[PDB]
Amino acid sequence: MSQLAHNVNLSIFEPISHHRANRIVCTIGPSTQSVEALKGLIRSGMSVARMNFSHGSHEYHQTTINNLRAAATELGAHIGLALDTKGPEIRTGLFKDGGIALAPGDTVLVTSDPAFEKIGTKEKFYIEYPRLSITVRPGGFIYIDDGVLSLKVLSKEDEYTLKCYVNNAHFLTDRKGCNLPGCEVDLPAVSEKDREDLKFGVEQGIDMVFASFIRTAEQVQEVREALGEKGKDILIISKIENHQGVQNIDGIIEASDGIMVARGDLGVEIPAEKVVVAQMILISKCNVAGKPVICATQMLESMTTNPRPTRAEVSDVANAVFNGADCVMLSGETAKGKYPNEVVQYMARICLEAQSATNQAVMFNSIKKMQKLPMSPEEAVCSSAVNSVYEVRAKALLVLSNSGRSARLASKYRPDCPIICATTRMRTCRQLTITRSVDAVFYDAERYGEDENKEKRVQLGVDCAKKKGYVVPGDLMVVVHADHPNQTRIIYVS
Amino acid sequence: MSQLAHNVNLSIFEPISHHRANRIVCTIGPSTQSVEALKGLIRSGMSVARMNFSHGSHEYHQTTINNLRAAATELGAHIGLALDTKGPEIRTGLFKDGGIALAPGDTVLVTSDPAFEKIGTKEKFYIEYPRLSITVRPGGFIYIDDGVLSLKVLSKEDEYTLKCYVNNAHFLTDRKGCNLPGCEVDLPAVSEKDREDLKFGVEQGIDMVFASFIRTAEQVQEVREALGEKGKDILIISKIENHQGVQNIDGIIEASDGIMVARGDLGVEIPAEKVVVAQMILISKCNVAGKPVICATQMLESMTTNPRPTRAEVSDVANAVFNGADCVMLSGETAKGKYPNEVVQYMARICLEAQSATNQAVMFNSIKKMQKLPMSPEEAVCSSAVNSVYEVRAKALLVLSNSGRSARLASKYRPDCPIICATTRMRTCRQLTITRSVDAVFYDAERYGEDENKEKRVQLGVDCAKKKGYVVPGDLMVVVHADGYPNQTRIIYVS
Amino acid sequence: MSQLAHNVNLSIFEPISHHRANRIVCTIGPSTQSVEALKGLIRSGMSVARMNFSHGSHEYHQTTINNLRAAATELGAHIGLALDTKGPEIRTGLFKDGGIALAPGDTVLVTSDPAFEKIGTKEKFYIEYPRLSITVRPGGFIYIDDGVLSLKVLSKEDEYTLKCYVNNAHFLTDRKGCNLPGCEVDLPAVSEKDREDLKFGVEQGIDMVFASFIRTAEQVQEVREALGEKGKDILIISKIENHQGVQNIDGIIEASDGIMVARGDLGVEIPAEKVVVAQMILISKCNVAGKPVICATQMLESMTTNPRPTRAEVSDVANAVFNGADCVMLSGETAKGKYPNEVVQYMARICLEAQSATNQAVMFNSIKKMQKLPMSPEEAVCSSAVNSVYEVRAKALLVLSNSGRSARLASKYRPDCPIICATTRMRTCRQLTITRSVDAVFYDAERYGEDENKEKRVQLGVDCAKKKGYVVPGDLMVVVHADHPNQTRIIYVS
Amino acid sequence: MSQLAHNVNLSIFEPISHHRANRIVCTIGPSTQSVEALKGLIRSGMSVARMNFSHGSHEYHQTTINNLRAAATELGAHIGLALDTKGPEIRTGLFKDGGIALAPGDTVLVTSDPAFEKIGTKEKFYIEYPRLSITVRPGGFIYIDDGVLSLKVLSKEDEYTLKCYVNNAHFLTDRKGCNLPGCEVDLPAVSEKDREDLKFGVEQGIDMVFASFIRTAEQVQEVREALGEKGKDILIISKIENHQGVQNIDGIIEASDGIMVARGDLGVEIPAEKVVVAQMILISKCNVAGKPVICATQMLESMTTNPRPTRAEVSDVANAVFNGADCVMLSGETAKGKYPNEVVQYMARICLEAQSATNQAVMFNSIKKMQKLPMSPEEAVCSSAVNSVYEVRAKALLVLSNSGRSARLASKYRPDCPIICATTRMRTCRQLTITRSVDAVFYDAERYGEDENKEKRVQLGVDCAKKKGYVVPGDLMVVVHADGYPNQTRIIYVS
Ligand SMILES: [K+]
Ligand SMILES: [K+]
Ligand SMILES: [K+]
Ligand SMILES: [K+]
């Protein structure tokens, strides 16, 4: 049938019997750094904790790491740990008396001539960007101090200098970050700080990396190389933040393990109505690729200080889910907000509402129709297992995958039931936290043996399903595992 | 194909070749009531002018009507004229000292006893709604003042009086609005002031009524009765504002000419996530029925006073279009905002982006898969005509329908091209302003003759698509007409 | 649904309510040359009369023509008139005493050296084919005297001469036709006799030509050129008789107006099981092209002298219909048989049985799915009209087409009801007799006017439908016609 | 895709890469009863040996059985052994002077009175069938002597005697066979000589019975009863020979293990064009049920005495395959013809041509579209396995089924590759010889162990596909088995 037919037969006041398939990423901040606070978040619905490396030293983040692992252990929970890189930046230079006041209607010259690095004035100051006047055009814009100060470029004065118009009052201070909307800029894939930070990330055993400002496939390869051999199993989620990213998404997807749609960042460069559509394209492309996609920024912002969001905000979360996002991310709302638990709980409810209003069969059919023939054995087995779920109406799907690969492959086909992955690696448990539908369960092969005939992982998988209330004796499950991940079975729960 | 495959093959940076199918309803007020501002709105992309009859007297609205018809005639435009009723209303009485401070954990007595109307205290105050004790039960909820004050009903004290638990802190002032979530509210379809508004409306030859707070099919019938014989051709668009209304959607739709999803009102009573889903359900049911649906309230609100809306707002509007809405409505943004024209231009842009990002073929198939076999001739002819537009890539669809019925029927099937409707009735032109994809063109039979063989109306329609830039010579159009209902199609080269 | 589902729900003893869509071509001979005989055939179910120009002079065929037109007129029937060309031949030379006896196991030399033209013996004789020993190989075969004498080529003796093995007793006589199975032979598209015959055909106003031995697209173009300007509206049906024909069918179809599958001819060269499959391919290709295809030879042969055929023969007729043939052709059975009327009647019954056992919706969907998008207006209109028939369950489809074009286009989409074509040309009436489903009705514009608003042709079309018992008042028809063939209507019969 | 699109893209001159899926049943007789000739037949492509029990004594058939098992063991082949019963029989009595000449327009009295058995005249003769006057009514028909003499019943003269109209000239001789078209014929399922044949059959461990002249489900049950406890695993294949049988096809199918379409017998009673359609209907119903169907009689008849058949005959055989038949049967062509081996080789060739010209995917879809949702596990597993063969292009499908049930279930879904069945039962090997696509391979559990984890049977099956030339290392196979019914699939690389 169809989404159209799903909508018209929907009873919006009947209870939802579905279980939450989407996953929530939370930013850790002052509101939420303690063991207790982190437990609250875990109980509320957090799957992944995001360290924002734009702020805070290594020891700040070490605290997040330690307290998160203490909390997760207490609760018997696998939580993903994500390092979100600062990324390259363009900074202003210095000012006399450490700052300057600008007024709506003033002109100010901005220059890449270093002679002005140390000596900025209301009238002229330095931006650390050698190709400034090859890059930014007249009528173009520059934003400074997290997008707060807006300058309209009036004209090119010389090869180092632009004349600008001040659109709003701001008091500008030493070495602020700059925005150059609409420009191919000459910045590296990773900064030197990024390099130190990724190194730290690898030493601390992070699960995934949110790579800032990704513009090309090669830049992703640079993050891969940075992480090096020792971090070859850390996932890279490339953050798409601008027109180049959106333009290069096919290659970036190929190179990455996943994508983050940074809506607010995109919205600096691109008309809002085109960010909406970019979000759709980017999400659909990841679905088709079977790679996790995370929707970030501008999510339930107003809930940072209010106990309830606007409907518009709620609708925007819903729609990311409808779009096909695995995950939705919270920023300030958990990092520094008044209601971190409540907002996470509320996200969970919204997700669940939208899940229930989606016809999953339609997306399954849609992904399926993208598949070229012949398929590889591994695609065939996973898409065939999902097809079996719909056909016999199974209430859970169990995959035995040590790396998580098949869990991701299954998920990509959008079964209308939960996916359980029995794995021998805790790392796989933490990394599956960004994959829709999935509950990872850890099989301890050191304790219980190698389980060559699978009997013990199947049984663990089934017990997990029973204990979360997905199945009871008499229900059907589909099980995917290796022979002596290419075997499927259809079983009754006993 | 599929929406998914449409998405992955989409380039957001290519120019858009499509022509806007969705329609914009604007509320007139002080920002936009002058002839000159109305011409601005029309040029900016208004199809329907909304007279909000909560506010303003008849004289004030007469100025709207006179100015609108002066403005529309100058620009040769057909503009829908809509009366939006005040409707029934639950308000509190007065408080001593002008208001009262209610803290959570407080209990308060609310009474429908007229003797307390003017002496509300922290202890006890008046609510105008006599069947209060009957329709709100213990465990039921009362929301006051745009839904910000929440009261749980603990018990009935007498027939006049309920004891309520205060859930949350709020300062409550003279005559604020009350809502009764979940309840069957026992107010009339039309207030007494609504009958006088309707009366004025029919006198002035309005095109449609936006009927407030519609909860049942029978209430739609009461609005139908109130317009009476004289007003029999005026479209009724039922406003769905609460739980009962959402629940009774099938009946209300069948009785109405179309639906308006009143999100702000819905959101007072219903949790926000269920408004999102409710909207989807309502729109999709209207889609199936081939009746216009209008998404209203909380659209681009911040743009009332700011030059820019938020991305979330823009997203909200776009998604109304994705859901399948024919129209989107502006309220304060045009009625009193600083950027009337700019907001309308911006809505048009959003609409057109979302249109371009939609796989129309998928909605065509979805609608078509729902028709029973065999089809009636008219249903086969209209769906066949829309299928032809896709198969030969025609660039407009021309429909000859004096009442507008076939144009609505063609728009149901979602062709990805414009729909021209040749009609002999001005009223139909104005009534079609709420139907997705349609541009009505008037055939003046008094000047050009009865056109028994349709040839003149067919040429008029082709000329219309030429003037508007939809087709040039060598393009294809698809034509639908009678030889009753439409029973013929043509496929033609534009000359 | 499907043919599979159609079969299982079929009630084989319930009456058939369908009307005969397939058409029957009859060969005219001694059994059937009189006015009376020809009337019998017309009443029995003949749509097309075939003159076989392999035998009989011009005056012989003039008699067929005259008597057929006399008969058709009496009965108020439009019958197609088809000239089937002799084609090029390879003849032997002469023999002393005008013949020679050969025995199973004898050797005989065959030569293209003309010195032997006049002087053939049991031991050596002439075949009029200069490239003989470049063409026929050892182990290859030659057949002489309508395929009766079989010679196996033992060896090449020199450049003019082959040594052969005699497989069967035959008494071989002056100037018999030869078969060279498995060979690209060097023969013209038309013979000089063919040229005279086509000329005669054009003077006598034939409707169509069955072009013998068509091997390439250019050869069809040669028949087109032969017929010339004066015969530019005569249809060419290319007869496929060998491997080259089957190999070149795409181009031959493109160039032709239709195809005849000459099964017996093909079966000389090609294994029987491959003729079965050739028949399928050739028929399907014509369907997809919207061009008539006729199944010929070896149809109900045994009914030439017996009052009933074998089941195998019956099944073979049925299957041509199932395959998708517009038409099935009778040869000796009507040309020289004992039961010309009965065999034609029996063909009609078989056709009708098979029609009723076919799921036409499946072929409609199948043709439809071949169509590239965009379609032209004319394809769109016809395929849309047929789609309407299924959708509102119309009981007839009426096209107004003076040339018959739209009738052929409609037919190609396989409606499950009869097609009526109102046309201003009697020639169109006669030519539509090879197109499945179609009843042509003649509108006399000289008598009744030009009917610019179509009212009179619609009314004539509807009356035709009523009078054949296809519709009654209250039924639906679909009508396709031109504006001021691009208008469709759906009407109720009054 | 579609059969149509498969046709137009087909090249008849390309070599065929497929392996024969259809099976050939051969009747043994004097041409082929020797060990040496049976080895010829096996090498030529016989899967099933048919003992025709209309003719020959037990000793004669014992020689068949002994020779067949000598021949099959030498070549290491599994050959189905089938008993085809004589069945009940309506014959005339004797005539004075050895026969009578009946001219059309003559009337004749036919009687079931035993006193006329030996004295038939032009006026009156005997037919052995006591309920004649009851089951043939005025207007009903009696066919005699392979259906060539047609009699219309005019009236019942007494309880013994019918007055008949002669439709057509014929010379009628001692004890010719009679048919009663349209009638419910009141003969037993099994004659007395049939019980002795069956008895012999079960003693000798035959694989299947071809049960003659089956008209009702209850008659199938009688054949089931006659094989009794000892013969409970012998397949019953019901022969459909007349109108009642065709009419009762749903019941007969449900009661049987499969069906044989007896065309010659059908054609005596039913007009030839309806036999063609009847065959389609029967085959398609067997297809849907997943039970084997065998097309028999009038196959390549002229090849009994000629080196070549006619194209029409070849066409007939090919179309049995297109219709969806699992098997085709040879009669006189092998039993007494001059070219036993050549006819079988030729059938194999025809079968394989027709196989190659079929779009198997279309039959897969057709079958699959008929399953109810939700499916049972076994149905989901088997259809899913066949789907995998198409999706990854596997080159054989391996099924572990001791009874053969899943192999039959897999063959229902029409994979376009061979099906290997690993079974622990020799009987299953022989029984699978009538199932489209299947090669059974025997797992000797006594020698190799019980194979609880299936690994040995999986390797055996892979080896079997290697020996047979279906796969090489690097190809894919699909595997089905239990962990009851089949509930697991694998997809594997051949090593
Ligand atoms: K960051
Ligand atoms: K209002
Ligand atoms: K000829
Ligand atoms: K027998």
Numbering used by the authors:
A (entry chain A), C (entry chain A): 1 to 484, 490 to 499
B (entry chain B), D (entry chain B): 1 to 483, 488 to 499
Give verbatim excerpts from the published study on this entry.
PYK exists primarily as a homotetramer with subunits of 50–60 kDa (depending on species), each of which is composed of four domains: the N-terminal (not present in bacteria), A-, B- and C-domains. Trypanosomatid PYKs are allosterically activated by micromolar concentrations of fructose 2,6-bisphosphate (F26BP), instead of F16BP which is effective only at millimolar concentrations.
Here, the first apoenzyme and R-state structures for T. cruzi PYK (TcPYK) are presented, thereby providing a detailed structural and enzymatic comparison for each of the ‘TriTryp’ family members. In the T-state structure of TcPYK (apo-TcPYK), the effector loop (Ala482-Gly488) is disordered in the absence of F26BP binding. Addition of the effector molecule (F26BP) to apo-TcPYK or apo-TbPYK increased the melting temperature by 2 K and 8 K, respectively.
